Amino acid sequence: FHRVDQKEITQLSHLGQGTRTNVYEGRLRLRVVLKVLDPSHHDIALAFYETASLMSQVSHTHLAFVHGVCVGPENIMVTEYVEHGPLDVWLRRERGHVPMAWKMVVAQQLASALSYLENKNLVHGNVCGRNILLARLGLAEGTSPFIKLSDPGVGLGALSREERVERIPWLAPECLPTAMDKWGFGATLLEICFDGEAPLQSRSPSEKEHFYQRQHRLPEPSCPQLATLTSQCLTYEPTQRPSFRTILRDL
Ligand SMILES: CNc1cc(Nc2cccn(-c3ccc(C#N)cc3)c2=O)nn2c(C(=O)NC3CC3)cnc12
């Protein structure tokens, strides 16, 4: 990854929070986003650098760009500013008015980005609607949506059990104690089908953990065109999950 000097960046409005981060709009001497890591232990900073490294070594139409990292107790990932923000937020605002054909384009674009990652034997590890950014809305007639899958933030391996429980239903059950992205992908399809209302999201940490410990399965989507696909992706057996080559073909 590229090293960014603090003199080259300007920090503007707070956009929201990530895991152990604060996301701000900014300027790079370009409009960008600044992912400000909380004061952290070296294991966390390392997991943050590993993400910036992974995202700086990849290039795909549906993957967000990483400009670099600015490093005292402050670690800032300088990443792509995407026009319309998170998919989950947009789906809730547009609830009941999002056509099936629009959802199918998003699913295909997401499967495309994940197939590219799969071919290179790389793991994203944080696939959810929140990390899917809308570059184009595709609301006007003769237009379609355009997504950018955001960087996964602090790597999954560096997070606490409490943080992994907070990631349910997107977290693969084998991660509770490349196949994990197939589950993340399936849970994201359900979330898209239910207009940004993910299953179990409202439930308590104890309830979410019990759901996985008791091996319960996630609901079927309201969209029948994705029922088989989500059932195949959301199996507790990682080896039984289809490849993104198969998913992309089946879409
Ligand atoms: C216009 N452009 C952008 C806006 C934006 N906003 C938010 C960031 C974080 C949380 N929330 C949020 C959710 C829910 C609530 C509530 N309630 C409040 C804030 C956002 O809205 N994030 N973002 C990124 C990006 O990489 N963000 C990382 C998440 C991946 C890139 N461009 C943009």
Swiss-Prot record:
Residues 9-251 form the Protein kinase domain. Observed in all cell lines analyzed. Expressed in a variety of lymphoid and non-lymphoid cell lines. Phosphorylated. The modification Phosphotyrosine is found at residue 24. Tyrosine kinase of the non-receptor type involved in numerous cytokines and interferons signaling, which regulates cell growth, development, cell migration, innate and adaptive immunity. Plays both structural and catalytic roles in numerous interleukins and interferons (IFN-alpha/beta) signaling. Associates with heterodimeric cytokine receptor complexes and activates STAT family members including STAT1, STAT3, STAT4 or STAT6. Interacts (via FERM domain) with JAKMIP1. Interacts with PIK3R1; this interaction is important for cell migration. Interacts with MPL/TPOR. Belongs to the protein kinase superfamily. Tyr protein kinase family. JAK subfamily. This is Non-receptor tyrosine-protein kinase TYK2. It comes from Homo sapiens (Human). The lineage of its organism: Eukaryota, Metazoa, Chordata, Craniata, Vertebrata.
